[PDB]
Structure formats: structure tokens, C-alpha cells
Write a protein that binds this ligand. Structure first.
Ligand SMILES: CCCCCCCC/C=C/CCCCCCCC(=O)O[C@H](COC(=O)CCCCCCCCCCCCCCC)COP(=O)([O-])O[C@@H]1[C@H](O)[C@H](O)[C@@H](O)[C@H](O)[C@H]1O
Ligand SMILES: CCCCCCCC/C=C/CCCCCCCC(=O)O[C@H](COC(=O)CCCCCCCCCCCCCCC)COP(=O)([O-])O[C@@H]1[C@H](O)[C@H](O)[C@@H](O)[C@H](O)[C@H]1O
Ligand SMILES: [Fe+3]
Ligand SMILES: [Fe+3]
Lengths: 309, 309
């Protein structure tokens, strides 16, 4: 089945994509195209991939882009997690230690959420008779415990059905999405509802491929974070909730030590009144430690096309 | 920049995509995913590809699928031509010689065209005052010159502006697309207009990438063919027209010896009348030789998602 060797493949890729160039070329794009196309041709030779199989692959990728699921596919195949493994190794090689650990952004961030200082209520109350109330609170500090005032804490999470606003058009714009600036004591408080885990769209392209791989498409319950402050490295992270069936079996491999929180139960009448609530609730503490920016530090910001509203 | 070696990459890909499998797996899909993902991770290590670059790559692929241009990108990068180079080498290894040579289908075939016996007029006459008339004719035979009656000759080509019907909604359905069954003398005749070459959609995703590579996105004038008959190997081919600026500089690399025809000029009054025309015209002869199907022959049919109307 080997019709071309790697020398012959490299020569053909060069003839088609490099020899044909006239004038200014983007050298990085040229480098990446030449590498990936040569690698594709070699895998076609090694696995004897048939034309019908190549076309099915391209039709799948077309359908995935049309469904806006390529970000989801990157999470599910573990490419998104792999980028984090690389970033962690680059930071170790720089001697960066400390800081709350990073994990994946996922494909569902939306820019433009309501901003407030110290406190936000994240939900619109439309599920109040069908989901538990959750209070999240924490302090943002540097690596020696000094508070950081005015840190931007951005949080987003799913509703009682595992659905996110903006993507789920039945929810109000920005439901369960807020930006909270830490107060004079480095504190943020979010009044919200308990998120549930969820799967991929069952009839979508990501689940179709996972099915062929014998894999589920479920994530455990979590709340996403971006945390940033002047003079500090931006953080992309989450917390997970102890007790979830999928805690250590996330189809996107995002759970890590340091990021699992326990939801405590508050049933005490006095404490409930003090919080201005009328029913028992769940409470999570999630403190965040930020690493100070250094001249030597690799960038911790990621340019990525994100929804906005 | 090397944060993982290939052993470590292979172990991670296996942990994420193979160890997680429960129940029935499609073994071929699993094999291809594991190979391509390991190759991607290795190229990310070797070229130190940054997260922002990965996201830009995925956003490009998303936009390309949304524009329905991934078939066009496969032609332009030379992947489609590479599949033909492989098919030619498999046929040589089988001892298949003879036959009109194959070349690429391209992404613009549409199933359901008008069918007729021996003769078809391909155009609707809407360009008759702005393009030259072309008559194409030929005989379909086996490799020793014996005629084949009832062979299905499917032809499609661009208008005077380089545009194809179905894709260009200004044209009538199936304009310049016909199926002609060879007559009792193995003959087909098509009355049509001269095709012009064309470029990629200038504001589209394929041209955007070609621009970064310093490359043009133009094809020389051509007419596409599928030819099939009971007992014979299906053929995907075209002819090109001598004289085209881009004849040997097709951005999809489709031109080959054996497939370039010369358009002759017919100005003779008697011949024009005999054809029932009123002006000079162009004439192309394109005979087709088909190879008989053998038990040993590799399949020459390609399953691919194609438009229909
Ligand atoms: C880059 C590779 C270039 C391509 C060039 C190489 C590609 C080669 C792949 C060939 C695979 C073997 C084919 C076996 C025969 C197919 C039979 C079949 O059941 O058809 C289909 C099988 O074909 C595939 O889906 C394979 C896609 C894998 C490619 C992406 C993984 C690469 C990893 C990393 C690269 C970076 C990629 C980035 C990662 C983020 C069935 O379909 P589907 O359920 O998976 O999706 C289904 C489906 O196909 C339905 O038709 C659709 O309607 C539905 O919505 C969809 O969900
Ligand atoms: C498979 C790989 C998985 C991905 C994972 C690996 C991907 C890594 C690629 C990184 C490349 C280096 C990035 C450099 C910095 C980017 C700056 C920039 O100008 O941004 C963009 C550069 O990014 C790219 O386009 C690279 C895409 C190459 C991937 C496909 C080739 C792989 C070959 C074979 C694989 C099989 C693939 C199948 C082949 C058929 C500019 O955009 P654009 O003009 O090319 O398209 C533009 C554009 O981007 C506009 O934003 C859009 O609006 C417009 O419509 C579009 O035309
Ligand atoms: Fe999420
Ligand atoms: Fe064409």
C-alpha cells in the first residue's frame, strides 16, 4: 500500500504549496501548512486511507463546523487539555510555582456580562422552585496571602438542566454569567443556583464521533472562571463539585487536584436569615491565588474567537 | 519547547481516546483518530504551536465549513490530486494499463442532470450574444478500439464568466450539466458554449489562505467528465483547452498529458449550415477509452457527498 515514501511526499507538498508561491508569504502559516499536509499524506500512505474515507472525514469536518462544534470536538478529543499540559510544562521550565491551577476554558464563554463590585446574583429566579440555591464565595490573593482589591472574577455555568445561556435561547441573555470585581477585602460573593453536569448535543457531530469510539460525552458539574488583575498573570480555571458521578471521568479531562470543592449544606435558621434567604442552601468556598507577572513569565493570555452579546 | 516526547504523546492520546472506550468501537475510526491526533500533538511540540495559533486554525476550519469550501481547500492544497497519484500507483501495481487518464472531480458535481441519447444541448442560450459556441464530440471504446453503446457520459462546466449552475443561483437549474448516453456507434455529441477558467471566491476562506501562501487560486478552462458503462471501470476525468494562461499552472494541479485538447475553428459556410448554426464555432474532439473491469482491479468508484437537484 505504500505508494510514496516521505522524501517523495515532501517533494510533492513543496511542488504544490511552496514552489507555486509568488511575492510575500506568511512564513509561519507556510511552515505549519507544509508540516501538517506532509503528515496527512504520510498517514494516508501508512494506513492506506481510501478516497471514500478521506471524503467522509472532510464531510464530517464540514458538518462539525456548520454545527459550531469544532471547539467541543477539541475538548472531547483532549486537544484542549493537551494545550494546558504544555502550558504547565512551559511554566515549570520558567520556575513558576504557586497559583491556583489552570484548566480548560471550554467553548461556551460569552463576553459582555453584567459587572458589579463585591457581590452578584447570577440567576434570574426562573428555576427557584426546581433547583437548589448556591452561594459561592472566596478571596483573591497573591502567593503570600496578600489580598487583591479590584480583581476581575468572571464566572459562567449551566442551569438545572445542564444548559448555558446564549446557546440555549430559552434563557435570558447572560443568565448565570457575571463579572464580579473583588472588594476592599479581596472578596467576591456570587448568589446562584447549583449547576448540573451535561452531555454533548445527542444528535450532534461530537457525540456521533464519540459513539464510534465507544465513548460517553458527559462533563461533571463545574463553574468556569477567568480571574485577572493589573500586575498578575490571567487565570483560566474552574471548580468541580465533590460527589459528581463524572468527577474523575470528564469527557474533556478538565478535573484536577486543587480544583475540587465540597458543597456544604446550610440548614441553620439564623444563618439563612442572615443571608436573606427563605430555604436551606449550598455553600462553596473557592479562593484564588494569582501569580505576579514577571518579565520572564510566558504569556498566560489566549487569543480565541469568543461569542459576545 | 519540547514538553512531551512521542512515547508520552502516545500514552496521553491512548488514555484520553482508547482507555475511555466502553462497549462496541468502530476499530477503523479509532485507528485513524489515534494516529491523526498523535501526529497533531507531535507537530504542536515540534513547531511550538501556541494556543492562540491552534484556536486560529480551528476558527479557520469552522469558517471554511460554514462557507462550504473544504472541498475547494482539498483541491487547492493538492490533497485531491494526491489521492489520484495514489490511485494511479495502485493501478500500476495491479498491471492496469491503458484507458484515458483520471484527474480530480473537484467540488462542483450535481446529481440529477437531464439525460438524452447520443446528443445534448448543454446551454440555455442566455449567453448566445457574449460567448463562442462549442461542439464537443467523441467515441467511447474499450482499449482495442471496439465501440461501447449506452455508456453514460456526464459532463459539467462553467459559463462565460467562469461560474457553475446550482452554485450560481442566477443560472437556470442544470445549465451546462448533462448526461449523454452513447449511441449505436459509441458516439456522444454536446452542443454548448466555450468554458472560461476562474478563481476561488475572492473574499472566501480558500483564497484567504492562498494569499498567506503567496499563491493564486485560478484554474484553466476545462470540461469535467464521469464516464461509466456495464463491465467497465468508472472514469473521473476532464479535458483542458490548449492556449489557456493557466494550462500548466492550475491551483488544483489537475492538468495531465493525454487530457489537453485543441479547439479547432470552424468558419466554413457549408459546415456551419450542416450543423444548423448561424455563426462560426469551436470544435473539440475528446474520445474516451475505458478499461474492462477485472476481478483483480482496484475499485475506481468513489463514495463522496455530492449535491443533487
Ligand atoms: C484533519 C483531517 C482532514 C480530513 C482527512 C482525513 C480524514 C480521514 C478520516 C477517515 C475515517 C475513517 C472512515 C471510515 C469509514 C466511514 C464510515 C462512517 O461511518 O462515516 C463516518 C466516519 O467518519 C468520521 O466521522 C471520521 C472523522 C475523524 C476525523 C477527525 C479526527 C482527526 C483528529 C485530529 C485531527 C485534527 C482535527 C481537529 C480536532 C478538533 C461516520 O460519521 P460521524 O458519526 O463520525 O459523524 C457524523 C457523520 O459523518 C454524518 O454523516 C453527519 O451527518 C453527522 O452530523 C456527523 O456527526
Ligand atoms: C487540521 C488542523 C487542526 C487545527 C489545529 C492546528 C492549526 C494550526 C494552524 C496555525 C497556523 C499559524 C497561525 C499563525 C497566526 C495566525 C494569524 C492569522 O493571520 O490568522 C489566520 C491564519 O490561520 C490560518 O488560516 C491557518 C489555517 C491552516 C490550517 C489548515 C492547513 C492544514 C493542512 C492540512 C490539514 C488537513 C485539513 C484538511 C485540508 C482540506 C488568518 O486567516 P485565514 O486568511 O488563513 O483565513 C481567514 C481567517 O482565518 C479569517 O479570520 C476568516 O474570517 C476568513 O474567512 C478566513 O478565510
Ligand atoms: Fe462548562
Ligand atoms: Fe471545474
Amino acid at each position: 500500500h505504500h505508494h510514496h515514501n516521505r522524501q517523495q511526499i515532501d517533494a510533492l507538498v513543496k511542488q504544490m504549496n511552496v514552489d507555486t508561491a509568488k511575492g510575500p508569504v506568511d512564513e509561519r502559516i507556510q511552515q505549519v501548512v507544509v508540516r501538517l499536509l506532509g503528515d496527512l499524506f504520510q498517514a494516508i500512505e501508512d494506513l492506506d486511507i481510501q478516497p471514500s474515507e478521506v471524503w467522509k472525514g472532510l464531510e464530517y469536518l464540514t458538518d462539525a463546523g456548520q454545527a459550531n462544534e469544532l471547539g467541543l470536538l477539541a475538548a472531547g478529543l483532549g486537544l484542549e487539555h493537551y494545550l494546558d499540559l504544555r502550558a504547565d510544562e512551559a511554566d515549570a521550565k520558567a520556575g513558576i510555582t504557586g497559583g491556583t491551577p489552570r484548566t480548560i476554558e471550554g467553548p461556551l464563554y460569552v463576553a459582555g456580562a453584567p459587572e458589579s463590585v463585591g457581590f452578584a446574583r447570577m440567576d434570574d429566579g426562573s428555576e427557584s422552585d426546581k433547583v437548589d440555591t448556591l452561594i459561592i464565595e472566596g478571596t483573591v490573593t497573591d502567593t503570600e496571602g496578600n489580598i487583591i482589591e479590584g480583581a476581575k472574577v468572571e464566572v459562567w455555568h449551566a442551569n438545572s438542566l445542564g444548559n448555558y445561556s446564549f446557546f440555549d435561547k430559552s434563557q435570558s441573555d447572560f443568565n448565570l454569567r457575571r463579572t464580579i470585581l473583588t472588594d476592599v477585602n479581596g472578596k467576591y460573593v456570587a448568589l446562584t443556583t447549583m449547576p448540573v453536569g451535561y452531555g454533548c448535543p445527542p444528535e450532534g457531530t461530537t457525540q456521533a464521533l464519540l459513539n464510534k469510539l465507544g465513548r460517553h460525552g458527559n462533563r461533571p458539574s463545574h463553574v468556569h472562571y477567568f480571574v485577572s488583575a493589573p500586575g498578575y498573570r490571567k487565570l483560566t480555571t474552574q471548580f468541580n463539585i465533590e460527589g459528581d458521578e463524572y468527577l474523575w471521568d470528564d469527557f474533556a479531562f478538565a478535573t484536577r487536584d486543587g480544583l475540587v470543592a465540597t458543597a456544604t449544606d446550610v440548614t441553620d435558621e439564623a444563618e439563612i436569615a442572615r443571608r436573606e434567604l427563605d430555604k436551606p442552601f449550598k455553600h462553596i468556598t473557592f479562593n484564588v491565588e494569582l501569580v505576579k507577572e514577571a518579565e520572564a513569565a510566558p504569556s498566560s493570555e489566549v487569543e480565541r474567537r469568543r461569542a459576545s452579546a
